[PDB]
């Protein structure tokens, strides 16, 4: 019987039932550092074109919102779009033999414009259904075979996390004062370092960075706080882990990868015009969770209340 | 007494107290599909004007951030604003009889500019207090009677949700592999379908889509995960519900509806100029919550501890 | 013994163990009101320049996302940047005596461009390492000594919070119907008022607004819901508190303050060009948390189960 009582007490200390768990409040501020030199040859409208230039912080990212930030790793640029009438891009759905194939007003999910009910030539006696939209229609083409900002794995992200427990009135930040800021996060060498190379994060998660960077993806950074408020056993430090949140469906219907359509509006020769930039990139989700533990007398009284009857039966 | 013990055991199985609840981690990636053809007549500065064009994905929305995305359903465009001196728009607060009514430097909450202390004609011997701001002052006028992007109810939103329970080390996504992607969500016909028509969501919540689309609103999509990790009773699927989070105050002081002031900056004839686009739309909040349940021995020991003393009293 | 039983019952009522706690769902919609007149003298490239104009809502803020909104309090504008070759800005790392000091291709964390391996004059026989980037390189200079939008403390923010408890099926909003909207939040005078002056929030947190506004910071607004669902003791109102989430590291390596690099792209004389606006401001994080309490029979049965054995021992 005594060993059952003792296994009860040990169950208390091991489960930490004497402490009252408190939820975790987290705020995140991130600063991304690095630049990328882009020199590549991109085929546009069947003609070879040269993409060159340097991309600094303002070019490939924007400030974090909703505990998540994004890094553009690749892109496809269509310029000079203007509202008008224009044959749709040749695809399995758009090709037409005659005007009967196109219904005036028909909207297709792959199509970016409303059909005009006419079947017209796109190029060299190959006819698509004419549509009304921003034109010329953006190409239906694959992403660049090497991601233009393939240096995205070399950039470094600095994460600054502030956590507060209101029930215990305890506030602490991810970066303790006096810590040597110059470090690169490592699983064993620098567990508390807040500077993470993106390629390091992809190596930890086992996913090759380049492949994800070609068509875009969603990565996730987990910050764990297992915190104890008792003065005789106190420790409130974060544990960094990395997980790939992207589904990797690899199906055209499921919209694989992470990419969005950017629209820049300008006026030229007294004409309303748009430049459409298809943006491919890796969005990093920062997930912070924690429990605050302090000795609660009432919780210990309820636990004792259970283990007294559980105790007498032994 | 035996029926009290048995009602205790049944209370355990029914409340699932033997399992330890775990918090839910959710990440959301959404892709919106559809286009809207806009043809309408809008009165601008007392003169009839024609608004026409096609709006594709890049025009009426932007990528989701903070587990929420927005769809512009209506708009009001003021163009050519430039910094300068200019009579404010005629309202109950702005109309002045003489220069004494305007105090130089006075800032009014409805006014977008600082008064210059002068009372000047706006149009046809009707005087407003002259202000310093981006001018001409945007009209104080109602939204278009039919929302310009009234097709907003026909668009379809694809929601992709990844949930993880860290305590149980269990990860699953909203879309199971192999599910037929071609579907439209229905309460009974397609409960697991991740494609939702916006008008479907507004019909479920009982709110007419057009009315909300005229002046904007805030809609909310709820995803519930009641998940059980035990191998003998395992089920971890989402439940979709829809709720209107917008307050619908319908009071000018409470800023009714959802709308924001967009600023596009350009330079013309060596002059700094701005175009102000008042954006009306429906912001969709995706709310995901869940509990992870697995058999915990210590929890069962504490419960047993209570029900043994509760038991002996019977 | 009777006093131990009674201290148990009092422990129940005081800890509210008879009620089952439910998590809190929060959605936030905020509308910011006010304008700022900016008249200041800013030194640019060693030459005095005059910054003047009026900033309305669209100029200094954008809609809240992820339960947080931002207000630009200060800025530094570099205009006319274009891709090319150009000497880096003179700093401790950039100054070069000869071409040997610069390595072709070297990327420096403080530098915004890739070195070309050449050491060239910046101004008056003072040589920096030549780099390839958007040029001229933005100045490495301090923020304006008075924040250009120093009126940021006078603006007013309206916060509208909707909370829902799903387990109890109870929904309520921050603003009750019929409340006089005209109010300014005060700790004692107006505890339920949803209109907060920014300078009021900084006075509550004890941080001078101007200092934070010069280089930017992160502020946090806490909304507490302690809600009871029982009809005989029902109260579900918010408690507003204010806390400064910014770390205030004041170290160049830790990127002190809150600021981000904004990029506006334009084309001039058939040349791709960029204007880089360094944005300093105060980001307000709205944190809402709550517990829903209703009488649960099973919870009371487990508590009774503990306190019966705890009871008999006395
Ligand atoms: C949130 O705060 C903002 C911060 C920045 C911007 C500007 C912006 O849209 N930049 C985009 N990046 C580029 N171009 C564009 N657009 N980067 C390129 C720079 C040169 C040449 C490029 N060529 C092709 C594609 C991208 C290019 C981005 C979508 C961030 C990748 C807007 C913000 O919101 C108002
Ligand atoms: C987050 O990523 C971004 C994605 C896109 C944009 C461009 C943008 O502001 N588009 C806006 N939409 C339109 N015009 C504007 N501005 N749509 C119209 C298209 C033609 C004619 C229109 N005419 C009147 C009103 C809107 C029009 C929008 C505010 C989204 C409704 C910026 C982003 O942040 C950098
Ligand atoms: C999210 O919805 C958007 C709402 C607005 C904008 C426009 C914008 O970027 N405005 C910026 N504010 C200014 N200029 C810029 N850029 N304000 C100035 C107005 C005159 C003169 C100024 N001069 C210097 C610095 C700022 C100035 C801001 C970054 C908000 C401070 C973009 C949005 O995303 C698509
Ligand atoms: C990252 O930097 C290292 C060292 O400069 C270089 O060897 C490597 O090729 C870079 N990676 C990419 C993708 O450019
Ligand atoms: C939180 O703890 C600090 C510790 O010094 C104390 O000064 C402060 O008053 C506490 N907060 C409250 C609300 O009691
Ligand atoms: C920080 O660490 C780096 C390398 O680990 C070292 O070069 C540097 O001197 C350290 N800084 C301090 C202040 O110790
Ligand atoms: C949505 O589409 C249907 C079928 O094309 C059409 O009958 C309906 O009028 C559309 N709704 C709007 C608001 O355009
Ligand atoms: C989570 O479960 C999987 C199941 O195969 C296992 O391989 C993995 O090691 C587990 N994670 C941890 C941290 O133990
Ligand atoms: C999916 O369902 C649609 C209609 O419900 C049907 O036309 C289509 O053939 C289905 N796809 C598969 C692969 O069964
Ligand atoms: C805020 O407004 C008051 C009253 O108009 C004024 O005295 C004060 O100087 C203003 N503050 C700033 C920073 O402009
Ligand atoms: C929530 O409570 C209201 C109170 O009238 C009730 O009408 C509604 O049916 C309840 N919801 C559910 C899902 O039972
Ligand atoms: C609201 O309060 C203000 C000042 O506190 C007062 O001037 C106004 O008349 C009040 N409104 C109502 C409807 O009572």
Any chains having at least 3 CB pairs less than 8 A from chain B are A, C
Q: Strand B68-87 and strand B127-135: pairing?
A: antiparallel
Q: Are residues B167 and B273 in the same domain?
A: yes
Long-range residue pairs from B262-267, CB within 8 A, at least 24 positions apart, any chain: B262/C58, B263/C58, B263/C59, B264/A265, B265/C264, B266/A266, B266/A267, B266/C266, B267/C266
Minimal-distance CA residue to ligand 3 atom 14:
C59
Question: C148 with C75: CB under 8 angstroms?
Answer: yes
C156 is in an annotated binding site: yes
Do the Cβ atoms of B68 and C63 come within 8 Å?
Answer: no
User: Cα dist. C114→A149, C84, C123, C275 in Å?
Assistant: 15, 11, 20, 19
Of B63, B67, B181, the CB nearest to A254: B181
Instruction: Answer for the pair C240, C51: CB distance below 8 angstroms, yes or no.
Output: no
Residue B154 CA, ligand 1 centroid: distance in Å: 30
Residues of A in contact with B305 (CB under 8 A): 303, 305-311
Cα(B169) to ligand 8 centroid in Å equals 7
Burial of B305 (0-12, 13-18, 19+ CB in 10 A): buried
| Token pair of C192 as six digits | 């339920």
Question: Are residues A288 and A161 located together in one domain of the fold?
Answer: yes
Give the residue on C whose Cα is nearest the Cα of B251.
C181
Q: Do A68 and B65 touch (CB under 8 A)?
A: yes
Range B89-110 burial, b when 16+ CB lie within 10 A, else e: bbeeebebeebebbeeeebbee
Which helix (H) or strand (E) is A55 found in, with range?
strand A47-55
Residue A92 structure tokens: 């399995």
**Least distant ligand from the CA of A77:** 1
Please check if B150 is assigned to a binding site: no
Name which of C86, C256, C307, C311 to mutate to probe chain A: the one with the most chain A Cβ atoms within 10 A of its Cβ.
Answer: C307
| Whether B286 contacts B174, CB under 8 Å | no
Query: Quick one: A192 and A136 in the same domain?
Result: yes
Residue A10's φ and ψ, nearest 5 degrees, are: -60, -35
Domain match, C309 and C168 both = no
Taking contacts as CB-CB distances below 8 angstroms, the residues of chain C near B251 are 181
Instruction: List Cβ neighbours of C188 (8 Å cut-off, separation of 6 or more).
Output: none
| Residues C12 and C28 reside in one and the same domain | no
- Inspect the interface and report whether the beta carbons of A247 and B160 lie closer than 8 Å: yes
Could you tell me which chain B residue has the CA closest to the CA of A266? Answer: B266
d(CA A32, CA A35): 10
Atom of ligand 3 nearest to the CA of C70: 30
A64: Cβ–Cβ under 8 A, 6 or more apart, which residues? A28, A29, A30, A286
CA C75 to chain centre: 16
Chain C positions in Cβ-Cβ contact with residue A27 (cut-off 8 Å): 218, 220, 245, 285, 287
Distance, CA of A112 to chain centre: 26
CB-side exposure of B208: number of CA atoms within 13 Å?
6
Residues A2 and A28 in one domain: no
Which token pair is A193?
């370092």
Closest to B11 in 3D by CA, of C236, C265, C159, C304: C304
Same domain assignment for residues C105 and C128: yes
Residue A46 C-alpha, separation from nearest chain B C-alpha, in angstroms: 25
- The shortest CB-CB distance from C305 to any of A68, A306, A311 is to A306
Cβ–Cβ under 8 Å, residues C63 and B252: no
Nearest CA in chain C to A31: C255
Backbone angles phi, psi at B204, to 5 degrees: -65, -45
Separation of A122 CA from ligand 5 center, angstroms?
72
Q: Examine the domain organization and report whether C271 and C311 are in the same domain.
A: no
**Distance between CA A71 and CA A148 in Å, rounded?**
13
What is the least distance, in Å, from the CA of A105 to any CA of chain C? Answer: 35
The neighbouring-strand residues paired with B227 are B292
Q: Going by DSSP bridges, is the β-strand pair B156-165/B25-33 parallel, antiparallel, or unpaired?
A: antiparallel
Residue nearest to atom 22 of ligand 3 (CA): C59
Residues B24 and B6 reside in one and the same domain: no
C112:A33 CB<8 A: no
Backbone angles phi, psi at A291, to 5 degrees: -130, 135
Work out whether strand C127-135 and strand C68-87 pair parallel, antiparallel, or are unpaired: antiparallel
Cis amide linkage into residue C136, ω under 30° from 0: yes
Residue in B closest to A217 by C-alpha? B29
Q: Residue A181 and residue C253: Cβ atoms within 8 Å?
A: yes
Q: How far is CA B67 from the centre of its chain?
A: 10
Cα(C104) to centroid(ligand 7), Å:
60
Contact C73 CB / ligand 10 (< 6 Å): no
Cα–Cα distance measured from residue A279 to residue A258, given in angstroms and rounded to the nearest whole number: 9
Q: Which atom of ligand 7 lies closest to the CA of B36?
A: 14
Q: Which of C275, C159, C264, C259 is nearest to C215 (CA)?
A: C259
A31 annotated to bind ligand: yes
**B234, B311: one domain:** no
Distance from CA of C182 to the nearest CA of A (A): 31
The alpha carbon of B111 and the centre of ligand 12 are apart by a number of angstroms equal to 20
Burial of C252 (0-12, 13-18, 19+ CB in 10 A): exposed
Residue A263 near ligand 2, beta carbon < 6 Å: yes
Interface test mutation site (partner B, options A24, A259, A260, A267, max chain B beta carbons within 10 A): A260
* Total tally of structural domains belonging to chain A: 2
Burial of C39 (0-12, 13-18, 19+ CB in 10 A): exposed
What one-character DSSP code corresponds to residue B188? S
CA distance B195 to B203: 15
Q: Is B45 left (phi over 0), alpha (psi -120 to 50) or beta?
A: left
CB C307 within 8 A of CB A305: yes
Q: In chain A, which residues have their Cβ closer than 8 Å to the Cβ of B306?
A: 305-306, 309
**Burial label, A265 (beta-carbon count in 10 A; 0-12, 13-18, 19+):** middle
Q: Which atom of ligand 6 is nearest to A180's Cα?
A: 1
> Please, which residues have CB within 8 angstroms of residue C113's CB and are 6 or more apart in sequence?
A35, A54, A56, C86, C88, C131, C132, C133, C134, C135, C137
Which chain C residue lies closest to B309 (C-alpha atoms)? Answer: C309
Interface probe, candidates C115, C136, C243, C292, chain A, greatest A C-beta count within 10 A: C243
Angle formed at CA C18 by CA B288 and CA A313, multiple of 5 degrees: 110
Show the tokens assigned to B297: 């021995």
- Chain B residues touching C312 at Cβ < 8 A: 309
Same domain, B105 and B226: yes
Q: Distance between CA atoms of A260 and C13, rounded to whole angstroms?
A: 54
Q: Which ligand is nearest to the CA of B190?
A: 9
Where residue C6 sits, what CATH number does that domain have?
A: 1.10.287.940
Contact between A33 and A241 under an 8 Å Cβ cutoff? The reply is no
B12: containing domain: 1-19+295-314
Pocket test for ligand 10, best of C60, C150, C151 (most atoms within 8 A of CB): C151
- CB–CB of A117/A103 below 8 Å? yes
Scanning every residue of chain B, which has its alpha carbon at the shortest distance from the alpha carbon of C23? B289
C33 close to B107: Cβ distance less than 8 angstroms: no
Contacts of C260 in chain A (CB under 8 A): 62-63
The minimal CB distance from B83 to the residues C54, C301, C310 is found for C54
Neighbours of B169 (CB within 10 A): 9
| Ligand 3 atom at minimal distance to the Cα of residue B83 | 20
Residue C250: which region, alpha, beta or left (left: phi > 0; alpha: psi -120 to 50)? left
We report the CATH number of the domain holding residue C273 as: 2.60.490.10
The tokens describing A261, both together, are 């359509």
Same domain assignment for residues C247 and C302: no
Atom of ligand 12 nearest to the CA of C180: 1
Q: Contact B236/B192 with Cβ under 8 angstroms?
A: no
Distance C224 CA to ligand 5 centre (A): 17
d(CA C75, CA C213): 10
Q: Collect all residues with Cβ–Cβ distance below 8 Å to A2 and sequence separation of at least 6.
A: none
In residues, how long is chain B? 314
- Assess contact for A228 and A234: CB atoms under 8 A: yes
The method recorded for this entry reads X-ray
C286: left (phi over 0), alpha (psi -120 to 50) or beta: beta
A96: left (phi over 0), alpha (psi -120 to 50) or beta: beta
């Amino acid at each position: 019987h005594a060993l059952v009582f003792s296994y009860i007490s040990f169950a208390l200390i091991s489960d930490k039932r004497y402490q009252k768990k408190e939820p975790l409040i987290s705020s995140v501020h991130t600063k991304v550092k690095g630049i990328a030199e882009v020199k590549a040859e991109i085929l546009e409208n069947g003609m070879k074109k040269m993409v060159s230039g340097v991309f600094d912080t303002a070019d490939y990212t924007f400030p974090l919102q909703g505990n998540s930030f994004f890094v553009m790793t690749n892109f496809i640029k269509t310029e000079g779009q203007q509202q008008g009438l224009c044959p749709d891009f040749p695809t399995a759905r758009t090709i037409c033999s005659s005007d009967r194939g196109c219904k005036k007003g028909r909207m297709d999910p792959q199509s970016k414009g409303i059909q005009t009910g006419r079947c017209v030539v796109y190029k060299e006696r190959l006819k698509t259904c004419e549509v009304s939209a921003w034109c010329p229609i953006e190409e239906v083409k694959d992403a660049p075979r090497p991601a233009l900002l393939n240096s995205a794995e070399n950039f470094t992200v600095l994460i600054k996390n502030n956590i507060d427990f209101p029930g215990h009135n305890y506030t602490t930040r991810n970066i303790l004062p006096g810590v040597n800021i110059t470090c690169t996060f490592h699983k064993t060498q620098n567990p508390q370092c807040p500077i993470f190379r993106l390629g390091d994060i992809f190596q930890e998660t086992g996913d090759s960075f380049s492949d994800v960077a070609i068509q875009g993806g969603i990565m996730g950074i987990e910050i764990y706080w297992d915190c104890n408020l008792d003065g005789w056993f106190h420790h409130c430090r974060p544990k960094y882990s990395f997980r790939r949140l992207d589904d990797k469906t690899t199906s055209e219907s499921l919209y694989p990868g992470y990419n969005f359509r950017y629209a820049k509006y300008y006026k030229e020769n007294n004409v309303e015009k748009r430049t459409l930039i298809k943006v491919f990139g890796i969005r990093f989700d920062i997930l912070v969770f924690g429990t605050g533990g302090k000795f609660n007398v009432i919780q210990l009284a309820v636990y004792i209340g259970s283990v007294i009857s559980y105790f007498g039966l032994a």
